[PDB]
Enzyme design. Structure first.
Site, short mmCIF file in Angstrom:
data_model
loop_
_atom_site.label_atom_id
_atom_site.label_comp_id
_atom_site.label_asym_id
_atom_site.label_seq_id
_atom_site.Cartn_x
_atom_site.Cartn_y
_atom_site.Cartn_z
N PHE A 1 51.02 -3.13 27.29
CA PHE A 1 50.72 -3.62 28.86
C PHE A 1 50.61 -5.24 28.82
O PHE A 1 51.43 -5.88 29.80
CB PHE A 1 49.15 -3.40 29.29
CG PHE A 1 48.90 -3.89 30.69
CD1 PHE A 1 49.14 -3.44 31.65
CD2 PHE A 1 48.11 -4.92 30.55
CE1 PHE A 1 48.78 -3.92 33.12
CE2 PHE A 1 47.49 -5.70 31.81
CZ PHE A 1 48.01 -5.12 32.96
N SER B 1 57.69 3.38 17.04
CA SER B 1 58.09 3.56 18.56
C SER B 1 59.42 4.34 18.86
O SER B 1 60.40 4.42 17.87
CB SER B 1 58.75 2.05 18.77
OG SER B 1 59.09 2.20 20.08
C1 LIG Z 1 49.95 0.53 39.44
C2 LIG Z 1 50.64 0.02 38.11
C3 LIG Z 1 49.60 -0.96 37.34
C4 LIG Z 1 48.68 -1.81 37.60
C5 LIG Z 1 47.60 -1.77 36.66
C6 LIG Z 1 46.67 -2.80 36.89
C7 LIG Z 1 46.63 -3.44 38.41
C8 LIG Z 1 45.25 -4.39 38.86
C9 LIG Z 1 45.01 -5.29 37.86
C10 LIG Z 1 44.22 -6.74 38.18
C11 LIG Z 1 43.46 -6.58 39.21
C12 LIG Z 1 43.88 -5.29 40.21
C13 LIG Z 1 44.47 -4.30 40.04
F1 LIG Z 1 44.63 -3.18 41.01
C14 LIG Z 1 47.41 -3.26 39.25
C15 LIG Z 1 48.53 -2.50 38.96
N1 LIG Z 1 50.03 -1.33 36.16
C16 LIG Z 1 51.25 -0.66 35.39
C17 LIG Z 1 51.53 -1.03 34.05
C18 LIG Z 1 52.56 -0.24 33.55
C19 LIG Z 1 53.52 0.54 34.21
CL1 LIG Z 1 54.93 1.40 33.47
C20 LIG Z 1 53.17 0.96 35.33
C21 LIG Z 1 51.86 0.44 36.24
C22 LIG Z 1 51.62 0.76 37.45
C23 LIG Z 1 52.55 1.61 38.37
O1 LIG Z 1 52.45 2.98 38.36
O2 LIG Z 1 53.15 1.32 39.07
O1 LIG Z 2 58.86 -1.01 24.24
C1 LIG Z 2 58.92 0.09 24.13
O2 LIG Z 2 60.00 0.72 24.46
C2 LIG Z 2 57.76 1.00 23.53
C3 LIG Z 2 57.42 0.65 22.39
C4 LIG Z 2 56.52 1.60 21.58
O3 LIG Z 2 55.97 1.06 20.55
N1 LIG Z 2 55.99 2.39 22.51
C5 LIG Z 2 56.45 2.69 23.66
O4 LIG Z 2 55.99 3.79 24.00
N2 LIG Z 2 57.48 1.99 24.09
#
Ligand SMILES: Cc1c(-c2ccc(-c3ccccc3F)cc2)nc2ccc(Cl)cc2c1C(=O)O
Ligand SMILES: O=C(O)c1cc(=O)[nH]c(=O)[nH]1
Ligand SMILES: Cc1cc2nc3c(=O)[nH]c(=O)nc-3n(C[C@H](O)[C@H](O)[C@H](O)COP(=O)(O)O)c2cc1C
Ligand SMILES: CCCCCCCCCC[N+](C)(C)[O-]
Length: 358
Positions: free
Chosen positions: A69, A186
């Site tokens: 993340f 990974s």
């Molecule tokens: C919404 C979201 C979000 C996401 C997560 C947390 C927040 C958030 C963070 C701070 C405060 C408020 C919030 F809504 C917003 C959006 N994170 C992702 C991270 C990785 C991936 Cl692959 C997808 C997401 C997605 C998504 O499904 O689009």
């Molecule tokens: O960066 C990526 O593609 C990745 C790394 C990892 O360790 N695991 C994963 O799901 N994605």
């Protein structure tokens, strides 16, 4: 926009955000907002029941944010503000690299799952090193307060020498981490022993205040032989712990998402029990003597406690955050505490590996 509230985020804010943005855009925005501290809550006050002492550290609560993340260490403090008891950044590679071409992340909403093939997009060690140095003393206080920092170490795509990539990460980010993670996972046995010997020697070469725990992160797709081999090397070398598990390259029957046949690692609910079972097996293989961080489809207290009961000392989540948002952290903690009480555990520590003693 504004504040919630689990119901408002889960039923309204998050789905709206998912409908407006592709997953990589929403990821970048999430990291952005988090790093600026633009968070709701967190109204949850951690009780002594949730406290864990493991890997030479105190953990205020056992619920961490999984690697992937915050890949580049940009939102560590905002993630603590979110209520996570620990933060893992990375994976970080020695040199900067772009990762795979876009699109490379795919939502499976019907499955509460994601498929990703980011490919270790990384700002690289040097950039991450300086970013962690700028807040190093703040982190020392957080750690002492029971909020440790983990660094997940990767390797470059075109790297000639995998072990040396990890050794470099150990030397560069190791002094800044409470624990380090090497992905064997990974999307050896003598080779694995060779690599981990090198990593541990590099860690031991650091000054005493700058010595992290070393953990190995595994996939859920290993054979029984692989798992036996890993357990054996872990115990022989004195690896400090295991993270179980990474994403899966399997595609369990029943996936509904239109994007289910995308290449990459699958995360979220379809990974949940596969991960718990791997925790169960790795715990028995290591005689309950090697701390495990359980990760894979955790979005509730039950999910968390199943992994704890199966042998995890701590848990992580990631995909749940993408569907539920920030309030998922307090939700998991509140439910876990209630479940612990319901099941007659004094705290999280009493529940670790409890299924194995039934
Ligand atoms: C919404 C979201 C979000 C996401 C997560 C947390 C927040 C958030 C963070 C701070 C405060 C408020 C919030 F809504 C917003 C959006 N994170 C992702 C991270 C990785 C991936 Cl692959 C997808 C997401 C997605 C998504 O499904 O689009
Ligand atoms: O960066 C990526 O593609 C990745 C790394 C990892 O360790 N695991 C994963 O799901 N994605
Ligand atoms: C978008 C995405 C990127 C990820 N990147 C990494 C990575 O950089 N390194 C790593 O060890 N795990 C990475 N993971 C795997 C998670 O840390 C975790 O092991 C896995 O997603 C299972 O947890 P979850 O079901 O709660 O998401 C990533 C997962 C996703 C969803
Ligand atoms: C990524 C979309 C995030 C939108 C949610 C905004 C967070 C609310 C901020 C709360 N607060 C007023 C305390 O700053």
């Amino acid at each position: 926009m504004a504040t919630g509230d689990e119901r408002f985020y889960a039923e309204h804010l998050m789905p709206t955000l998912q409908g407006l943005l592709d997953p990589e855009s929403a990821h970048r925005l999430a990291v952005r907002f988090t790093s600026l501290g633009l968070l709701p809550r967190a109204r949850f006050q951690d009780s002594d029941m949730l406290e864990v002492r493991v890997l030479g550290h105190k953990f205020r609560n056992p619920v961490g944010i999984a690697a992937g993340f915050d890949k580049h260490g940009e939102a560590v403090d905002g993630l603590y503000k979110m209520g996570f008891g620990f933060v893992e950044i990375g994976s970080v590679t020695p040199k900067p690299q772009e990762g795979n071409p876009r699109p490379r992340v795919f939502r499976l909403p019907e499955d509460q799952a994601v498929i990703n093939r980011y490919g270790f997009n990384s700002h690289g060690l040097s950039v991450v090193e300086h970013r962690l140095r700028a807040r190093q003393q703040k982190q020392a206080k957080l750690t002492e307060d029971g909020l440790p920092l983990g660094v997940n170490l990767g390797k470059n795509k075109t790297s000639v020498d995998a072990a040396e990539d990890y050794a470099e990460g150990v030397r560069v980010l190791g002094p800044l981490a409470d624990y380090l993670v090497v992905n064997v996972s990974s999307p050896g046995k003598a080779e694995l022993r060779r690599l981990l010997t090198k990593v541990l020697q590099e860690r031991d070469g650091l000054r005493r205040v700058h010595r992290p725990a070393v953990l190995v992160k595994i996939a859920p797709d290993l054979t029984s032989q692989d798992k036996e081999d890993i357990a054996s090397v872990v115990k022989e070398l004195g690896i400090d712990g295991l993270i179980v598990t990474n994403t899966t390259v399997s595609r369990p029957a029943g996936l509904q998402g239109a994007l289910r046949s995308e290449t990459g690692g699958l995360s979220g609910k379809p990974l949940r029990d596969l991960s718990t079972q791997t925790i169960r097996e790795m715990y028995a293989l290591t005689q309950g003597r090697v701390p495990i961080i359980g990760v894979g489809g955790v979005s509730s207290g039950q999910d968390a406690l199943e992994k704890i009961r199966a042998g995890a000392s701590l848990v992580q989540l990631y995909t749940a955050l993408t569907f539920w948002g920030p309030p998922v952290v307090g939700k998991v903690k509140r439910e876990l505490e209630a479940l612990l009480k319901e099941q007659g555990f004094g705290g999280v520590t009493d529940a670790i590996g409890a299924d194995h003693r039934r």
